[PDB]
């Protein structure tokens, strides 16, 4: 049970909890349903690194209570 913090450019943190098996794909999905955003626009930055959808918290290097930098991109409205 690892707890993390997703921070954006709005200086706001969105606490979350995942599993070593859960991967960005899912964190992105949830983080999307949490703020009501989409994973297809969200970018998960780890220590200044644009994570991928095929990485697992275990491979991303995320641990318990860590923090993940992120940002939401424009909506399909374009």
| CA separation for the pair 67, 6 (Å, rounded) | 6
Residue 27, SS3?
A: helix
Tokens of residue 15, six digits: 């606490």
Tokens of residue 16, six digits: 């979350």
| Domains detected in the chain | 1-78 (3.10.20.90)
Burial status of residue 41 (CB atoms within 10 A of its CB: 0-12, 13-18, 19 or more): middle
Q: Are strands 13-18 and 42-45 parallel, antiparallel or unpaired?
A: unpaired
Q: How was this structure determined?
A: NMR
Q: Where are the beta strands (DSSP E) in the chain?
A: 2-7, 13-18, 42-45, 68-72
């Amino acid at each position: 049970m690892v707890s993390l913090t997703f921070k954006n450019f709005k200086k706001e943190k969105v606490p979350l909890d995942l599993e070593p098996s859960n991967t960005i794909l899912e964190t992105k999905t949830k983080l999307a349903q949490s703020i009501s955003c989409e994973e297809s626009q969200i970018k998960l930055i780890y220590s200044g690194k644009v994570l991928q959808d095929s990485k697992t918290v275990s491979e991303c290097g995320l641990k318990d209570g860590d923090q993940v930098v992120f940002m939401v991109s424009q909506k399909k409205s374009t």
